[PDB]
Amino acid sequence: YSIDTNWYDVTPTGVTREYWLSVENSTITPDGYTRSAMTFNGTVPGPAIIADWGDNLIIHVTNNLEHNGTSIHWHGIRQLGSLEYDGVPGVTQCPIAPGDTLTYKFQVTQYGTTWYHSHFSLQYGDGLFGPLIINGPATADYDEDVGVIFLQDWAHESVFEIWDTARLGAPPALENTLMNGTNTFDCSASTDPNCVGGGKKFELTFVEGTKYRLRLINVGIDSHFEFAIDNHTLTVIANDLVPIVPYTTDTLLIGIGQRYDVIVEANAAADNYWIRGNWGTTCSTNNEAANATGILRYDSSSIANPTSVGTTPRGTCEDEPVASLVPHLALDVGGYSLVDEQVSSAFTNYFTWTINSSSLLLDWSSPTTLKIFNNETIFPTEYNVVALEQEEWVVYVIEDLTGFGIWHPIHLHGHDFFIVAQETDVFNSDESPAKFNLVNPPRRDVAALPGNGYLAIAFKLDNPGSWLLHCHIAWHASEGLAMQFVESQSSIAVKMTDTAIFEDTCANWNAYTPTQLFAEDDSGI
Ligand SMILES: *[C@@H]1O[C@H](CO)[C@@H](O[C@@H]2O[C@H](CO)[C@@H](O[C@@H]3O[C@H](CO[C@@H]4O[C@H](CO[C@@H]5O[C@H](CO)[C@@H](O)[C@H](O)[C@@H]5O[C@@H]5O[C@H](CO)[C@@H](O)[C@H](O)[C@@H]5O)[C@@H](O)[C@H](O)[C@@H]4O)[C@@H](O)[C@H](O)[C@@H]3O)[C@H](O)[C@H]2NC(C)=O)[C@H](O)[C@H]1NC(C)=O
Ligand SMILES: *[C@@H]1O[C@H](CO)[C@@H](O[C@@H]2O[C@H](CO)[C@@H](O[C@@H]3O[C@H](CO)[C@@H](O)[C@H](O)[C@@H]3O)[C@H](O)[C@H]2NC(C)=O)[C@H](O)[C@H]1NC(C)=O
Ligand SMILES: *[C@@H]1O[C@H](CO)[C@@H](O)[C@H](O)[C@H]1NC(C)=O
Ligand SMILES: *[C@@H]1O[C@H](CO)[C@@H](O)[C@H](O)[C@H]1NC(C)=O
Ligand SMILES: *[C@@H]1O[C@H](CO)[C@@H](O)[C@H](O)[C@H]1NC(C)=O
Ligand SMILES: *[C@@H]1O[C@H](CO)[C@@H](O)[C@H](O)[C@H]1NC(C)=O
Ligand SMILES: *[C@@H]1O[C@H](CO)[C@@H](O)[C@H](O)[C@H]1NC(C)=O
Ligand SMILES: *[C@H]1O[C@H](CO)[C@@H](O)[C@H](O)[C@@H]1O
Ligand SMILES: [Cu+2]
Ligand SMILES: [Cu+2]
Ligand SMILES: [Cu+2]
Ligand SMILES: [Cu+2]
Ligand SMILES: [Cu+2]
């Protein structure tokens, strides 16, 4: 097994790996400002889940929150034959009730960098995410793996406090950003007792001449980054969970939920350097956007702020150029049927996004998968179901008709897709399909729907189940910018063990909902 192994077809034998995670109500001080958080195991980021390609994960998730369901998603994890462990509440399970435990089981049939996060409403915005790193092949050599660097915005209160405001349609400017869970913040004016100060920059220490694999993930609520390290080059070796033909870049545009693995050679004059998130100010607002930075040190004892000169950011909300993103294991898209769908917006009780006029709104007590187990094939209109059955491919064209010009990071569950087109133009059903790239196009699981343009993503019908596709901007998802593919419904294979477990989760959730303190007040996802 190697970098040229087809991991969609072949999977190594591995070992069983077991984790207990507690979804917790916490207090943290990541940037010198003390606030509530919703965490795995009291840390933001959550604990590292590290495994090998082909391992079986067993992850016992206990919900120790008092006032929310929860449901944990393993982002970009294919979940072939483990649909009920995808962690989408209202799609592949009922929410895990307070006090209850759901044990997620799945094999990792991919390798690279990803993460896990709650998919229950906005929870991941309060810190409910962690790294999921799967060891395997890599398209370039390096001597050291520094692991993951999370890039995010960071509020100074619960995302749930500001939801009622945000749902009037404008995402609010958050108070700060974190790089790998930390940042500075100026508390030396504040009369807020929580602003205790002492927040510190993310530090990364290089040994000169050593090669470092960095694993970048944008995990913000509503944030775009263009990661750069002053006077260093990034050699990009993977996008999401798909190794790519290495290419070098001064900066790396990164949408929410996207990952890149980069190799950085520490071949610069030994000094302190700015590490730049390069918050996309055009993409979304932040109170402290220029402070989305950290410190590269070649000398650990140095406590000096770097004074390096950075590269000029492209300053866009785009993804990396399609031409740059060439998977190592080349794969082409076969004959396809085309599904076309259109993003617009409406206002009801609040601001919603629509997919062909319907905003996603799930009933947590009746997930698509329960409906499937009950042999339903017609789904509520607000479940935004697109049915798929075998031409073994689908091109899904999603069009921004909102007029907003936001670059939406579109995430597909159950599949890597193929970026056959990512265009800043109006989609024409008679002209545009011709301009698709079907021959080893970029392949990944988050890609930008360009603002005012279209994203055309192809996938194979190789994974029966009900698969959410959504904007990964947390507000947008909560605002129903989502649909779901019900793929070969009659081919979905579920174990009696897993059906029993699913039913129990739903039973406990149904036992919880009559005295819940808080109702569902978003899409559910
Ligand atoms: C950004 O910030 C994050 C922190 O949020 C930071 O994360 C760090 O990532 C590093 C690189 O990826 C990482 O370094 C690695 O750590 C690995 C593992 O850490 C260990 O855990 C080991 C294994 O767990 C155990 O299994 C053994 C048997 O082998 C048992 O003895 C042990 O009891 C435990 O038990 C079992 O767990 C299994 C599943 O794991 C189950 O199957 C079993 O049933 C049982 O429950 C252990 O061997 C180690 O001692 C250690 O605890 C290393 O393997 C790897 O080689 C590498 O060194 C680091 O740990 C992360 N740190 C934190 C705090 O999360 C990033 O580095 C930050 N990024 C940057 C750029 O700074
Ligand atoms: C999940 O749990 C959290 C508790 O952490 C619940 O958050 C709460 O959500 C409600 C309803 O949105 C909030 O009420 C609103 O507060 C704002 C801001 O002060 C106000 O403008 C509104 O008029 C409204 O009253 C409440 O503040 C918020 N609480 C906290 C501590 O954040 C959330 O509703 C739970 N969701 C589910 C589905 O269980
Ligand atoms: C997380 O917390 C739970 C509950 O305390 C504990 O059982 C579990 O072992 C912890 N897991 C890790 C990875 O720290
Ligand atoms: C977390 O704790 C806060 C403060 O005690 C509480 O008001 C809130 O309801 C809790 N959140 C959840 C999801 O249980
Ligand atoms: C980052 O924040 C600190 C604290 O306010 C400030 O001194 C510094 O100027 C900031 N950098 C900017 C605004 O570019
Ligand atoms: C969505 O709407 C457009 C325009 O009416 C139409 O071409 C397309 O087929 C619709 N898609 C679905 C899946 O209903
Ligand atoms: C769903 O269909 C299968 C196969 O016909 C059947 O065995 C099962 O009992 C059905 N569930 C229902 C009708 O609720
Ligand atoms: C990735 O590669 C493409 C194609 O060579 C470039 O256009 C891009 O700027 C980046 O280097
Ligand atoms: Cu309470
Ligand atoms: Cu995700
Ligand atoms: Cu996902
Ligand atoms: Cu969006
Ligand atoms: Cu998702």
Numbering used by the authors: 15 to 404, 409 to 543
Excerpt from the paper describing this PDB structure:
Laccases (EC 1.10.3.2; benzenediol:oxygen oxidoreductases) belong to the class of multicopper oxidases catalyzing the oxidation of phenols accompanied by the reduction of molecular oxygen to water. Laccases are composed of two or three structurally similar cupredoxin-like domains. The active site of laccases comprises four Cu atoms classified into three types depending on their spectroscopic characteristics. Type 2 and type 3 copper ions form a T2/T3 cluster responsible for the reduction of molecular oxygen to water.
The aim of the study presented here is to determine the structure of B. aclada laccase containing the complete set of copper ions. For this purpose, crystals of the type 2 copper-depleted form of B. aclada laccase were soaked in solutions containing Cu+ or Cu2+ ions. Restoration of the native form of the enzyme was only observed in the experiment employing Cu+ ions. The structure of T2D+Cu+ was solved at 2.3 Å resolution. Superimposition of the T2D+Cu+ and T2D structures using the coordinates of 525 equivalent Cα atoms gave an r.m.s.d. of 0.16 Å. Residues 1–14 (the numbering given is according to the T2D structure) and residues 405–408 were not located in the electron-density map for T2D+Cu+. It should be noted that in the structure of T2D Cu2 is completely absent and the sum of occupancies of the copper ions in T2D (2.6) is almost equal to the content of copper ions per molecule for the enzyme in solution as determined by mass spectrometry. In the T2D+Cu+ structure the type 2 copper ion has a square-planar coordination formed by the His87 N∊ and His429 N∊ atoms and the O atom of a water molecule. In the T2D structure His429 is coordinated to Cu3α by the Nδ atom. Thus, the removal of type 2 copper ions could be associated with changes in the orientation of the side chain of His429.
